[PDB]
Design a protein around this nucleic acid. Sequence first.
RNA 1: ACAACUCUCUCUAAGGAACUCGGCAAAAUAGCCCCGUAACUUCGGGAGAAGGGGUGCCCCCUCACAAAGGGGGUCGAAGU
RNA 2: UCACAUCGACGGGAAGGUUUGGCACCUCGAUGUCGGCUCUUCGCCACCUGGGGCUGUAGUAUGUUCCAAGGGUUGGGCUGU
RNA 3: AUUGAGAGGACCUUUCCCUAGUACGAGAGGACCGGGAAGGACGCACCUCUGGUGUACCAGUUAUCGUGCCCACGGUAAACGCUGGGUAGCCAAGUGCGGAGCGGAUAACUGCUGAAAGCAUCUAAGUAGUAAGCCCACCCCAAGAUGAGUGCUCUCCUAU
RNA 4: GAAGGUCACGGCGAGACGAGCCGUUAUAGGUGUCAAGUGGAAGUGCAGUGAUGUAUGCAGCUGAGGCAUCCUAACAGACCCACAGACUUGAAC
Lengths: 114, 120, 219, 42, 116
Amino acid sequence: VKLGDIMGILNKKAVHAAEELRPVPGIRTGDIVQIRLEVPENKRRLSVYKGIVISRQNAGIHTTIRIRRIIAGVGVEIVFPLYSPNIKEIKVVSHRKVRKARLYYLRDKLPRLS
Amino acid sequence: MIQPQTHLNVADNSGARELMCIRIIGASNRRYARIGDVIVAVIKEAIPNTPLERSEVIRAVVVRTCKELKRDNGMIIRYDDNAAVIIDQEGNPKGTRIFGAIARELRQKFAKIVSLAPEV
Amino acid sequence: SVDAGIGVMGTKLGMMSFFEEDGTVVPVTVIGFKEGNIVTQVKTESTDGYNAVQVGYERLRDRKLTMPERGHLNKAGVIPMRHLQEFRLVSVDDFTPSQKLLFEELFKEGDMVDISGTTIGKGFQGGIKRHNFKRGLMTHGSKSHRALGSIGAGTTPGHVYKGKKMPGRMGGTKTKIRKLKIMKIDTDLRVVMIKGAVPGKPGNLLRLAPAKIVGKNIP
Amino acid sequence: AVPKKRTSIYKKRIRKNIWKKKGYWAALKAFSLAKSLSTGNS
Amino acid sequence: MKHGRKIHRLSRPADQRRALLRGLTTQLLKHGRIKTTRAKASAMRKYVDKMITLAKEGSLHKRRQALGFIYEKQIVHALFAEVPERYGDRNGGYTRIIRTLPRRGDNAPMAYIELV
RNA sequence: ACAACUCUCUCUAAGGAACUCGGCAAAAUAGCCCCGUAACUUCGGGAGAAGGGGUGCCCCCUCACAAAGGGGGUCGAAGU
RNA sequence: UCACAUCGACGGGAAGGUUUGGCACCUCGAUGUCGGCUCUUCGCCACCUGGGGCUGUAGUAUGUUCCAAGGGUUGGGCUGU
RNA sequence: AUUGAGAGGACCUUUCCCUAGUACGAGAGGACCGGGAAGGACGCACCUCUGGUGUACCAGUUAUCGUGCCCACGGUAAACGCUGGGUAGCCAAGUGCGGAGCGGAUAACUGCUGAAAGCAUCUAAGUAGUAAGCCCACCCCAAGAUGAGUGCUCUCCUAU
RNA sequence: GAAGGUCACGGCGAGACGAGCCGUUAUAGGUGUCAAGUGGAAGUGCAGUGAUGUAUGCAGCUGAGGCAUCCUAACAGACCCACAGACUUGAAC
């Protein structure tokens, strides 16, 4: 094994292990996601979360996604580790037709979006 | 990241409409207060007929912030607003209802806040 | 000086996000190895004035070495290597030369390791960046912006004090970051996973040796 | 700002001689290249 | 402080850097050998090699890709016709840097660049 | 060549005058069309007060409204 | 109750050289005057932090004073201050 | 390859919890000693995460000019025309780490044994506790330490 | 021409210049590829009077990062340096 390639290989294991826990679908920008996680508050109560994916920072094991939603009244923007053990169910509900890699503009547009 | 002279929305129905921060409390020589921390604020406006009048120095506790607090999970959480809740003294807020959404980190020191919350 | 165990040479290989079955996201440094950590020389109270063990690292074609170093390593009966580093211990025996140091067997996880190594070189840099000075005003007509302001006092001292903080070369120097968790020892790959950060970019040598707390050393 | 006295002599010699030694170094290097100019170089 | 930053500036702004590399690349392609400085030469290897590489896949798209570059139509039509015959074997590295004597009126170091 | 430092500039997470002798400096506003315009007044003013809405590109109604006016479409986060 | 826990009248004796002076010794062929910014350093006659004696010290919280200068000693409103 | 004379940096502080509602106190209140807690300021290092920048790169779009013309590109709109993204690097608002000793001698103080002075007395002999202060220890430098230390190893042929 | 050192030659997460460190048959560049960024090219087909959409296509363009491969340049070569170590005493085969 080449010493330069170790950090590649070490990612190659770490992703592909986690994906065999649960297969993650092909999410990307402008997709309505619902996502539930086994919250460790000493209770497996199953708090779901929902909203648009406004971003996708691809970066191996800590690949992650920025979900925006207008929660009760206010705007909220939770980013998730895509290959967490804590995360249980990812589901792609619907697909809006955006054409930009990140949608940070959507932060300051309207509440009627989301 | 709320500091001296920051304007802060109110997330409960104690009567006050908007606050302005003038000091952090707890952990002295702190530059700014992130979610969980208690601040001191002057009320800059209120609904007319409520008990809490304008121009009064009172304590609040910061619950919504524009500057991502982080879990150990790895999940981070922005909001779109900087907003605090008007604490009474030790325990509960003055109003018997809280709005918006609020985090789990608050429930250790402020049990009564996450009791009254809509969407935790 | 007197180190709490025998250390081991090593090489930095970037940073990983390492998970655990709780879901705690931990930042970690991948540390790789290259032929050996082979013991070279043993020093004693007897002949040399102190107790110590010299340990090479990193294999070479033996033309890139010089005659004297070729001799010094060929006396020990050892692969051609750079980077002979010492480890002054109180313990002296069972470190006889041409003996490989099993990093796997000599640490055993959850240890808290002390890592040294030469840092990133930031060249000749100003008072602000170097010594965490403050800068003066930007407007209100201040022709001072980034500077030292006054240096000294007046006619009484009548000179600039020794070790007065000034602009100079920041970086490219050894710093022991001490007490760092060992998160995982990959048996397969010979790669140590250490919590947090470590001096220098990917490539640097690292002197990896155990915690040096004051209940471990010399009262 | 301004000099208090003159360096005058001997010190200015010491200062100039290093500068002439810069010239010396250049001369050595230029001498070395002349042998390189003779034979090969592909 | 220029750590892991790799870009040949050529003493200029981005206005004139691309203007230099473009024109030098054109003239080099035209004549086949040019005399310039070491830095002006050594920087030029990314763009000559890129354009010869671009001349391998002679297609509508790639000719316009190259034609935005050269600012001389009749040189870029010399390539595409020429290149795949007289460079089909060669796999990268189409450029040689010979090096010859400083320039008189400024001790500026000097070199030759020409197609391999 | 791409050190500090100075100048001429470009951007900046959260906050938004907390700077400072003083918002000095920077930022923001901005063209046109339409709606709307207070105290006071020497009745001429104040007044572009303040404050709002519309503007790109395409296709149409008209024996006469300088891409008019109005109607309908289409693109971008954003149309002087 | 008791001068001496804590204050200490009438009076007496010291040190320090931070104030306001007195003198006119260097500098009038020039040593730039306040406050602010930047960056120091040092002294102890100790504001807090370490360790003590006494207390009109039950504890808490003090008061007083001994040792100690290693470290620290905020952000604004007003005023050139 | 190190030894360390020497010289620097760093030894800071906060409430909370247990001890314990215990000792004390009529109640009201509420410890000493020690052990845990998460911070503040401060320093050292890093870029995995969050980002700023990123005139290198990618995308939209105004004006006009050039590429013969449409298509599609290029130039200019100081030293990005104007925006919207951004890898590496560098950065913090981001991430790690740090402050530890049942080591030594002391300062105020508390003592033991003990006369001078048959008694007493911390002292004149001797000796024990005993501080963020002082010295070792931590971390960086260091034999120009002319006092130039110590170790391992290599080399001493000729016009070369 | 000793050991070695200095230059030159290709460089650098080292660097104001010197210095430091790596390389001189995997050092930089190129090429191939793959993480990554950006967001669906050009051309053509079809739809619409048209602005435009739409399929071919996680495209196309980048790729300062990793890895592979001597295709290019590391050619040519230069300079410095050697008495086995003055002098005195005392232990030792």
